[PDB]
Every structure is written in C-alpha cells, then in structure tokens.
Symmetry: D2
Subunit: 262 residues, 4 copies
Amino acid sequence: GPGSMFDLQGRSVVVTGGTKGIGRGIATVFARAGANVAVAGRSTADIDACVADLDQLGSGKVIGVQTDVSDRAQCDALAGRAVEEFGGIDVVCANAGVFPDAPLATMTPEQLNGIFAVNVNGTFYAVQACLDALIASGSGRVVLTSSITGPITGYPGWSHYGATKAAQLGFMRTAAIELAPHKITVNAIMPGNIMTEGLLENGEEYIASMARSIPAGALGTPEDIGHLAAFLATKEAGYITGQAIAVDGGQVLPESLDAIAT
Amino acid sequence: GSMFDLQGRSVVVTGGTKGIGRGIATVFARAGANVAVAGRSTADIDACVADLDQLGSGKVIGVQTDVSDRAQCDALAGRAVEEFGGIDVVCANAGVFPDAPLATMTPEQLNGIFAVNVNGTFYAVQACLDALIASGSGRVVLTSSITGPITGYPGWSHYGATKAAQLGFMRTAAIELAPHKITVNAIMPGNIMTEGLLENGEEYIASMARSIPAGALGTPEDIGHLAAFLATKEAGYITGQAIAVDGGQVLPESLDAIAT
Amino acid sequence: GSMFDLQGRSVVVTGGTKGIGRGIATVFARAGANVAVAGRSTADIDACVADLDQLGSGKVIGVQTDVSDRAQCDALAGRAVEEFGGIDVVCANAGVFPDAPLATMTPEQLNGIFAVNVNGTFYAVQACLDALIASGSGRVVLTSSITGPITGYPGWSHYGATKAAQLGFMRTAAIELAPHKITVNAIMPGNIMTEGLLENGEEYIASMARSIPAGALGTPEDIGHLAAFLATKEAGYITGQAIAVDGGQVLPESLDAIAT
Amino acid sequence: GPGSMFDLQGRSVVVTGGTKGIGRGIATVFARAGANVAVAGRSTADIDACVADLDQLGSGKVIGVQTDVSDRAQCDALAGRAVEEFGGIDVVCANAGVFPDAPLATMTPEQLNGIFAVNVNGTFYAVQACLDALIASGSGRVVLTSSITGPITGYPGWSHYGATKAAQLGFMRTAAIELAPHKITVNAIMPGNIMTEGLLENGEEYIASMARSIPAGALGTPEDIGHLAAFLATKEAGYITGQAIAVDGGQVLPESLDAIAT
Ligand SMILES: [Ca+2]
Ligand SMILES: [Ca+2]
Ligand SMILES: [Ca+2]
Ligand SMILES: [Ca+2]
Ligand SMILES: [Ca+2]
Ligand SMILES: [Ca+2]
Ligand SMILES: [Cl-]
Ligand SMILES: [Cl-]
Ligand SMILES: [Cl-]
Ligand SMILES: [Cl-]
C-alpha cells in the first residue's frame, strides 16, 4: 500500500501460464499485494478457478484470459484485455513454459520447434504485446521465468528446454538496453526445484530424495518465485535491470553431493 | 505481519556511516529494524545514528570498529546482541577503493585493501555467526561490486580482486551455513551517486551517466532496498546469489550499443 | 604424433564458406584434417573447397546444406562419413545476424533466425552423432557470440537469444554425450574482421577497434585456432565451456576503463 | 617448432609451484614443447629432481629456483634468474597455491591471512616481478591457476580457498585491460578434480567415488591443465584475454548426481 516499502497496490500485472505451479505462485503474490492481475492460461476451467481464488486475496481486479502464448495475435489480445480492464499494464511476468523431455539422440524437429514456440516465442510475444502499455506506464517491468537448467546447469533429456531457458536470458540482455530509454527494466528469475501440485503426484519419497541434493534441505515454493517477481516489480527495484537471479536453495553451488553440509 | 516485514529485525551494517552503507542502514531503519552501524570515525557514527534513530521504531546504535581486526568485529557483534537481544542480518558492507596501477602497486597497498575488504567480510560474518544461528532466519548480505566479478578497471586490479573474493567466500558460506537457515547473498553495485562522488562536480557525473543504459547513476537507497528484500523471510530460498544493481552498465558491448 | 596433432582427423564445418566458418575450415585444413564445408551457395562452396584442398594432406569436400532442415544435415553427415570414413569433429558454426528492433520484430523474423541459428546447431550435432560416437574422441564446437551470453546490442535481441540458446544446449549436451567420450564446447567470438565487414570501410573498423582493449578486431583464424585446440586429444577433459575470443571487449566497465 | 601450429619452441616460461602436481604438469608440457622453463618451489630436493627430469624432455633450458611466492622480493629474484638464463620471459604461469581446510566457524586470522598470502599475493607478485620482461617480450602471456572452487562452486571447509581462487579472476579482469597496450594476455584455468600423486595416497576407492560425480567418469591429469596453459601461451591465442576456462570433465554442469548420464 502507499507509504509502505515495496508498494504494489493498483499496479497492473499480466502473468502468462498463471493458472498453475510457479505462475499461480507469482499471480497469488501480486494479488495479495493489491495488484490488478490478468492471468493467462490454456484451460478455461483452470483459469476461472484461479481467478475466483485470487480476486479474494486483495483489492485489485483479477481477470482470466485463455491465451496460447506461442501465437503473437493471442498475446496481443491478452494485452488488449488487460488494458481495457485495468487502464494499463505496468508488469509483464513472461512465465509460460513447458518442460517435456527428449534425449538428444532421438529428439525430433517437432519436439525442438514445439518447446521453442512456447518457451521462447511466447516470451518475446508477451513482451511485445505489452510493450506499448509498458511504455505508457512510466515504471514498466518485465520479469521472465527462466530456470537454473540451461543458463547454469545441464540435465540429460532437457537440452532443448535448457536452450530455451538460456535463450530467454540472451533476449533479456539486449531487451534491458533497448527498453531502458522507456524506463522499463527487464530481469529474470531462475527457479531451482520448486514444489508444485504436479510434482506431488510422484510422492513424498521422490521429493525427499531430491531435497537431499539441495543445501536448503527442502524444495522451494511457488511463492518464493512470486515474492522475487513482486520485488523486481516495485519502484524500489528500478535500478536493477538485466539480472538473472536463481531461487534454488543453493542447488547449483555444491561441487558434488559430497560438498553438501548437513 | 505485512508482506516483506522487517519490523524488529536486528541488523548490523559495517561501514554504515557513509555512502552505500548509510543507504543500507537507512532503508533498514525506515523498515522498523534495529540497526547497529559500524564505522571508523566517532563523529560520523554519532551523526549517522542521530538521523537513523528518527526513521523508525527500532533501536539504533553506533560502534567504532576497524573491521580488519577480528576482535573488534567480535566486540561489534557483542554490542548488537547486548542491545537488541540478537542479530538477524549482517550487512558486510565495509570496503575501500584506493587505486594502484599494477606496475607500481606495493605490498602495503595490496595487503591493506585485502585487510579491509576481504578480512573485514570474513570477520564480520564470523563475529555475528552465533547470533545468526540463534536467529533462526539469519541473513548475510555482502556488498561486492561489478568491478572484479564482472568488469575490470585499470588501477583497481586489487579492488576487483577483493570484490570477486567476496563472491568466492559466498559460494562456500551459502552451503556451509544452510543447515543453520542462514542465507548468504551479495550485491554488486554499479555506479552509485554518493556525497563523495558529488565533490567531482556535475559534468563528471553526467559523463559517467552517458555510459549507463538507465541514463543516471543509482542511489544508495537502491542498494539498501535490495539488501532489505534479501533480509526478509520471503527471500529465504535465495542463497549464493550475486545481484548487480547497475542500471544495465555491464550489458552493452560498447558505447555504441547504448540506446537513448 | 606431435603435440596437438589433427592429421587425418575428420571435421564438418557448417557455414564454412565465408567469414568465421571459413577461418575454422582453413585452420583445420592446414593442420592436415579432412574437412567437409557446408554452405548455401554452390559457387562459394566450390571456391572455398578449391583453396582449402591446397592447404594440407587431408581430403576436402563441399556440400550445399540448409542447416535449418534436419534431413539436409543428415545428408551432410552421410557425405562426410562416405568420403572420410567417419567424423571426429562437428563445428556447428552456421548462423545469421539480421537486425530487428524489439518493437517491430515479426514472427517471421524471430522464427527465421532461430531456424538457422538454433535448429541448425541441434540438427548438425544430431546428424553427426552416430559418427562422433564411432570416433571414440568426438568433438562438438559451437560458434556462439559474446552477444547474448554476455552482452546486449539493441536490434539483436533475437540473435542474442539464439547465441545464448546454443550454450543452454551445450550445458546439457556435454553431460548427455560424455559417456560417448564426446566433448561439447562453445566459442564466443567478439568483433572479428571479415570481408563482409570491410565493405563498411576503414574508418568504421577503426572506430570499433577503439572500444577493444586489444586495439584491433580479431581474425577468423583466431576462432579457427581455438576450435582446433578444442578438437585435439589434448583437450579431452574440457567440456561444457564457452570461451570468448574478443580481445577483452566485454571487460571494461565503459570506454573510460580502456587503457592505451 | 617453427612452421608448426602452436609453436612454443624457445618461448621462455616461469612456473610458480612448478615442482609437483598441476604445476609440474604445466612445466612438463612446456618442456616437451621446446620452451625454456624456470620452475619455482619451496623444497630444493623437489626442485632439483623436477629440473633433472624436465631438462631431458626437449631442447629448451630448464632451471629451478627456490621461491616463496608470498614474498615480493623473492618473486623479483625468480624473474631475475629467468631473465639472466633465458634472455627474457614470455609466459608466467602463476600456479602456486595451497588448499588447507578451515570451517568458517573456526577459521582463524592466521589461517585466512596465510592462504591469501600464498594464493593471492603470490599471484600478484609473480606477475609484477615478470612484468618488465613480459613487456619486452612483445607477445607476453599470464596464465593463472585458479579452481572451479570459488568462481563457480562452493565446498564447506574451503570458503577461504574459494575466496582466493575468485580473487585471482577479479585481478585477471582488470589486468587483461591494464596490460593489453603491452600485448600481454591474461587468462585463467579453473581445474576441477585432477589426479595427483598426493591424491593417490588416499587410495583407489576414494578416487573412484569422486569420479562417479564427474560426467567424464574419471579425474583429469596434470597434463590436461598443462596443455591448456600451453595453448594460451601460443601466438595463436593472442586474441584471447580475460577468460577463465574450466578443465573439469563437466563436473560443474549437473544439477545434481541424478543428472549424470552413464
Ligand atoms: Ca480482488
Ligand atoms: Ca528508532
Ligand atoms: Ca587515488
Ligand atoms: Ca588437401
Ligand atoms: Ca539490417
Ligand atoms: Ca632441455
Ligand atoms: Cl545465459
Ligand atoms: Cl566471482
Ligand atoms: Cl548462456
Ligand atoms: Cl570470479
């Protein structure tokens, strides 16, 4: 709220892939902070359920828009809806992303192009769609959901995924310069291993095993990502641009499992 | 209770009486934190403490400390614990940046800059470690720089070396202190406007600013706001990160790549 | 038998007829390697092959290939295996760098640059993978750029995105191909003097050079020499590394930090 | 040799900590390549044994100099000996380093200052001592032995060590600019886990366990480091400066042990 540090009340936010997992975590934090939030996703049932919940969390308006981010024209439609309902857009959380696996030896052109269409083109298109509004904002913010996988780590089966997540940071490093005259910052979050509803389907033993490779000793939460996105979206983070920040409980630091202290 | 609450959190800021450190201390004081500022000059400490105590409901104290002396760091920690009941956050900010060309840099110049910039960082964290463990949500925030970890600047090879040393320390300390629920992160300031830098005059600053995509130098509060975020409960899953606060300074391939 | 021997090593270079790729191909040909150069223009391929075959005892072939087509990459690999008996090294070098401001960049411009720069990299490696496994000392060398992984340059957000994508690919491919004794590394050229760049004239080049600590643009052979090293048996424990060949271009904080 | 790619014949090299382990690996590669090599170390018995072996490997002159690199004046004496015997210095391999352990909670001022004196001051002093000769060379080369530990990874017990190894890279990033007008390049090697005589004292089982955390499936060798140092020292590597390159068999890449393919 006004007079508080890190005020986001009445700030207008678009979150792609905002109905589940990390995206819902970002949308939730913004909603609690009093922001107007447009959540985009592919399933109208998931969108409506998310909107119903989030609208109750704070004084901002929350809307849902079915959007395939891989289609520039649908990204334009999403930006248009947010401008019509909120009067503007101050923050775009280009979060939509998928992570199917494909060994390099078998990965097909369809698999390669498909993951790029969502993860990279959807990032570009979301930003371009919102750019006019972000300019008009005067304190615009672009927050990309990248990953430790690609920019920092590797993981067999995800060479395409990592390529997309690094691509987002290459985009960032230029977009931060290109958009600086408009007072728009462009930053990224690299989540490590975050507990989601999907991951819980695998059961408690699988998660505990993953947690043993993390210095923090536990997986993070979707709100861990949302809280950083919220910080980056504040007026107080205005001199931060072009940064990729890992939210990973130290996952990338140990030289091997033997380097983990408990 | 609010998002990003720091009310009643207890903070130690080394080199906290001037410049970036004063910016850090100020943001914490406004957030309702208890703040212990350390510095070398008792006149600057007393002036700083007088201004900060007025900003919020927290207790502010000032402690004359040479951070290059482990014993003096221990004494600073002791004072903070005695006066606040604990320490939740250490901002190891103290640092100096004299120049020395590589060709002429003396052993005395090399050792001196390391004693403050690097030994002062280890010692401030070590001194506060027992309290940070007792906290249950402890936080170490290091003030590094873009110079060293990212960029170079002739005359500052020793300084850059100290700034990068802090991040090397960080990457192990983050692992080593994780079992205690202490996060360890670093801020890499770019070009930040300070009182010291204004002595050079407005034309010098404007020239510097033309090399920054943001088109202006940052402020000490820019650094303090990031330190304050890292210090929140909400930042508990972020550790071992070095984060530049530089208006995009390190991004352009050359002056030619800056848009305006 | 000598240190850094490449005699009879079999190399595929995509985009090998011009610029940096021709530099790569040239260094390998001089080292006695068999070299397959791929390109889009049959006139450039035939001219390139004529010159390279004269440089060493290795066989040189030229193959017209659109690397954005997986099938054409498979055909290039097939030709190299048929003519050389195997493939020890793939230099996935092919790449384009048209500009497009972010504000106006079309889907066609975005997709096009990715098809060449990124899909062409995956496909060239995949096409050669069976041969690289059969090699026993296989090598993948990617031509990335400072732009994307390190720097930004307005008009090239898509290009930078492709260049960084290559390194994301690398970091997994290095792990995934390690059991096969295949290393995967990347070169990040800075500003390299090419025939294309000389069309702009000597004043433009001199201006660019003043922003580089080395004080000159690099050469295609600078890139080729690093690729050749990575391709040696002696470089077998180096994998997943991206190495800039840029005369220090990315280091200075600003033009003001350059010494002369 | 002349007319060969990567000629180092008659190039003049100073290697600090050059009598054992990685240093001896660097010195050996240079000796095989026909370089003049001055090896420095602390133990006259180790120096003389190393010099005897290396002098046989090629046509260059090899000398040994007892040097405590933490003392600037002894670094000057070392540079002086190399200039007197070889006529000049083209390459300094600032390799000397120690890696004692100290938990952060107990690390003393003596431990902290001691490791910095060798690992950092010895790097600065070796370069400064050789700088006049490197200038006179016209194709001078500084090669620092850093580590993955500090610049990239962490390892409990080695926070001071990692701080020293990162310090070397901060020095590099400025020295590369500062020395560029003299045509001196300044690069670093970050070894991962390298098999040395010291490490073999721990036995085969310990090493095999370490190897399982490495994508390459084995520890590297001192000559792996030496071959890269040799490459960086060539005329052909003249446009490479300010780079830190890991020689680690992929050790830093996996997100965890679960990400290792075999
Ligand atoms: Ca509401
Ligand atoms: Ca107060
Ligand atoms: Ca001065
Ligand atoms: Ca031939
Ligand atoms: Ca154009
Ligand atoms: Ca000899
Ligand atoms: Cl990246
Ligand atoms: Cl660092
Ligand atoms: Cl990258
Ligand atoms: Cl570093």
